Amino acid sequence: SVQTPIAGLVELALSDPSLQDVIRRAADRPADLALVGPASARVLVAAALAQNGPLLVVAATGREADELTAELRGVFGDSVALFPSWETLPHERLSPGVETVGARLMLLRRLARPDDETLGAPLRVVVTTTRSLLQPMAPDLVDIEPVTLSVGAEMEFEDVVARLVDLSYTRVDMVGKRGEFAVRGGILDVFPPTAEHPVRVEFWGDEISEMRAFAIADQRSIPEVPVQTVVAVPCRELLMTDDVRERAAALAAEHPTTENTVPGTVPDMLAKLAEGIPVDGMEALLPLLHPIEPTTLTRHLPEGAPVLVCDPEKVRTRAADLIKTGREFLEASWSTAAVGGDAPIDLEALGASGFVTFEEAREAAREGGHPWWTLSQLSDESAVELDIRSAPSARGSQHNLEEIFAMLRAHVATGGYAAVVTPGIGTAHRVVEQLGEADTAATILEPGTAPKAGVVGVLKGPLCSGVVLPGANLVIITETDLTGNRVTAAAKRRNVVDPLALTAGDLVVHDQHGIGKFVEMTERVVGGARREYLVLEYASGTDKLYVPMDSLDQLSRYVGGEAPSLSRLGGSDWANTKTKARRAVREIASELVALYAKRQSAPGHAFGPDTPWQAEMEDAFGFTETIDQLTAIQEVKSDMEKPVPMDRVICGDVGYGKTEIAVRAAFKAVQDGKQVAVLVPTTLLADQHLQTFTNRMAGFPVTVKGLSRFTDPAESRAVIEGLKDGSVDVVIGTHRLLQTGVTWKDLGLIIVDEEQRFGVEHKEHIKSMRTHVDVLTMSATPIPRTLEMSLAGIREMSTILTPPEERYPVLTYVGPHDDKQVAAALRRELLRDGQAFYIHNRVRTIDEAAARVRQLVPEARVVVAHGQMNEETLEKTVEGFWNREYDILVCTTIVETGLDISNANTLIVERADTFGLSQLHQLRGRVGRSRERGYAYFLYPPNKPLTETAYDRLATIAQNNELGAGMAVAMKDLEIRGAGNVLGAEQSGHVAGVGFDLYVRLVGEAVEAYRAAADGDVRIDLPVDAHLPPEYIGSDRLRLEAYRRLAAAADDDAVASVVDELIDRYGPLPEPAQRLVAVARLRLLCREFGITEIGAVSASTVRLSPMVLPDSAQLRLKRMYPGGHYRATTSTVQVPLPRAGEAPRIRDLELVQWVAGLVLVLNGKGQGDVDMSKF
Ligand SMILES: Nc1ncnc2c1ncn2[C@@H]1O[C@H](COP(=O)(O)OP(=O)(O)O)[C@@H](O)[C@H]1O
């Protein structure tokens, strides 16, 4: 169907007798076959060889392997698969991505099991790289029995979790990444490395009861994704057996280092391997841990399958680079000095897993029964040269374009077949229009068909470069050849809404008491009820406060002051500290709402709907728009169209595509005749956004111009500044656009980027421009959503959480500063013509530091950059680094965090101990954003003993984790300065002592009281065994979230949604949980009638604390509930509990309901208004 688009076109291409000649030659399986043809013919040749049976194709680099893999999936779909290459060198102390290992093992198991439907269709073409071809592997990797999960299979829970542990699956309390799994009572969550969505399986007894795929963000199940049998393949290329623990204990005996275990060294690694847990960099130790004879990839191919090698010369030339780089990483990582100096393991054994040479792989493939064939673009004498010519590539000069369309017209006039293959979405109709203007009959082909004779067929399919086959009377021309651009290729949100982490000793702020230190969580019984309480230390200095589970909304994690405040006490010292800040925030809210109102009543020309060109400009997008991006463009366009001048923020990570929203909004404002500006803090951003605005808006009468610091004063004084005549439709500029001399003619839209970095004078300038014209800001720092909805009326902010393309996480390595590892990593990043960040914050020595870098890599262009330089030199240096003039940038953290160099994907942090967690995460984030995998090296000095807090900190970032250990604790800090960039106040004085969460909560109070300018807890002490049992929710961090979120639910349907959350996430509700739910609904019923407290004064009586009763309801209390009296002075209603039998007092749901009906009949309504027997 639409799954094999170019199957008909290729099936037509095979009609050429040269490809059929190749099919005949390969049909008898000859020993030597040398083919010669153009590069773009690869997809053809393979597709011919696959007609006689399966085969393995080898490409030079991973990019060519991905390209040919897609081009073959366009004709074969699921039958052709890609055997990926490791992101790490074989002996490097870093493990590759779990997704890569998953794809490798799934592909090998598919090669060993073609009949297995659950793994996929039988293989016909396997495309791989030189690395994966040369990199050996253990022959027992395919024999590892995966964890097969099906609805109805009879299994045993603990055996399943144990088997998952053996397959290098990391156990966590919440599934967030691939290769993870969480264990809950009767429910197993697991994220296989090859599955698109993580799957949750419900066990009952000794067999699975249900299966359903869920989403990572809300952790809620997706019912519209049907889940068949899932095959959980291992996540590492090894098995954690008892033998590998034995040898890890023999090797672990030497280099023991029992005390003061360094994080990244080999005593810790081998110690944890003897303990059985998987650790990073484990694969390199395969020849010593699991010693066998390692075979190559070609053995796992089904017997008889041949091997076609594309451009073998380049395959060899790169192969030498794999062997050299891998050898350098082996010597570097496992030198005598780096293994702790003691009993250095011999490297000869470790050489077993290293890359085999080209000749060894050749003879190993031939001696295994698999022929070795070649396809080379260069002409050879004894080779079978195919009748295939490459496509004419019109460089972009439209005379060549018209000539190409003319040769197409002549070819179809003769009767030959012409096909124009366009992989882009929205570009086929454009080619149809171009052919119509060139007077050529065009037709958008049905996906999977062949071009009809006499008409050119515009087809949507994956192709890079076209191919001309005169033997088949066929001419295939790709969109790439016509436009000179390569089109590479859905997305799931990553909200991850489930953490409010707490560790022992952490500081929290209680609204009614103050700052205190967390201790633990306990449970006490008062009348047969297991109750849960969270404890805090409040300096009296030994006073402990047990906050219950009904008032968790008053607990805010203390953030703000880096220096800790002193814990509060039972006195009245804290209420004042609340009140003064409460008086210090409304001053901010005043400016906020006054800006919103001045914006509301201001006169500004609205923007009409999108003109006809906007569709073509939006469809000229190289990539694919994202759902969050589409909603953001709709909101931005609508706010432009609304008469109120626009003041909208765009929140998203660096590398998520908000700049496209900028260019599209700017274009929309241009189409209505209004010129626009873009304000950036640094000149580098003016150049980047300048080039993006050029490329996206080219081909239209729109002159884009920029005014940076380095724009010469001739063009600056004349062209840019003198453009008050409508000469510029859009100007990208730095702060020079904010001086007095500037002037606009019909300024229509302002685009701000990284508004936080601007100067204060420039900030007040931009805010002054806000009221008069439409503004549109972009931010990489996120904001707390509580502030998003707290200040929603004055300033709308749209969030983008759908990644445009899967940006796989960078590979972090914590370790001692070894020069060989640094040099090896820098040279590996230089191999792909990449760049690297080297961080040495001590400015005094930065020069010397860079010199030492040049000691390690002499062929590296190394430069320095720091904040002490004047901007005229610094921005020029950073410009040189962005223009690839330099290879390694030694800089301080201030300079590094604030650059967007996409080509830089390797980071070296010297003296990583000195940096905080947040700074380390920021540093790491600035690499590995593009299509390339990033690397990060957090290094601590080896000449001094590491500190305790550096050991802990480095340990948190060591095991790369998104958990509540600190990634979330230090994410809040990333939101603090974001708030400072959003709201006007920068002072942290009132934050320190109140808590930033309570600070912006008071901000919420003030701005909600000011927004409505025109307008001008219940305690239940009942003997009801209600709690969330630990067996139901094992993880305390999640159970506290269930408590809090259940308490915060404000209506019955919200409580029901919480119930559905607990049911889906953790399983069916137990009795104490349902009783707690009924207690919450009882709290709502109290709030409707304003009851503050319902407490049992004694074992036989109950008191409703605040009620006034008129004479009618007082008499009704006497008649319907005898024995009870109403005390008007204290204004309480005290009634006695009826005994259950003739004896025990009533409890649990009988008591809850009885109290409900009592409240009802006392407050007018009948006893049959509602029942608490639900849920
Ligand atoms: N939908 C997409 N898929 C893949 N890459 C994209 C997509 N949109 C934009 N990009 C790439 O990512 C970058 C877009 O982000 P950028 O323009 O740097 O602003 P920001 O990083 O703030 O989103 C560009 O370099 C672009 O090539």
Automatic annotation (TrEMBL):
GO molecular function per UniProt: ATP binding; damaged DNA binding; DNA helicase activity; hydrolase activity
Primary location group: cytoplasm
UniProt-listed SUPFAM superfamilies: CarD-like, P-loop containing nucleoside triphosphate hydrolases, TRCF domain-like
Domain Helicase ATP-binding span(s) in chain numbering: 639-800
Subcellular localization, as worded in the UniProt entry: Cytoplasm
Keywords: ATP-binding, Cytoplasm, DNA damage, DNA repair, DNA-binding, Helicase, Hydrolase, Nucleotide-binding
GO cellular component, as recorded: cytoplasm
Matches recorded under InterPro entries: CarD-like/TRCF_RID, CarD-like/TRCF_RID_sf, DEAD/DEAH_box_helicase_dom, Helicase_ATP-bd, Helicase_C-like, Mfd, P-loop_NTPase, RecG/Mfd
Domain of life of the source: Bacteria
Record-level GO BP terms: regulation of DNA-templated transcription; transcription-coupled nucleotide-excision repair, DNA damage recognition
Pfam families for the chain: CarD_TRCF_RID (PF02559), DEAD (PF00270), Helicase_C (PF00271), TRCF (PF03461), UvrB_inter (PF17757)
Catalytic activity, EC: 3.6.4.-
Domain Helicase C-terminal: 818-975
Family statement: In the C-terminal section; belongs to the helicase family. RecG subfamily. In the N-terminal section; belongs to the UvrB family.
Functional description taken from the UniProt entry: Couples transcription and DNA repair by recognizing RNA polymerase (RNAP) stalled at DNA lesions. Mediates ATP-dependent release of RNAP and its truncated transcript from the DNA, and recruitment of nucleotide excision repair machinery to the damaged site.
Protein name: Transcription-repair-coupling factor
Native source species: Mycolicibacterium smegmatis (strain ATCC 700084 / mc(2)155) (Mycobacterium smegmatis)
Gene (UniProt): mfd
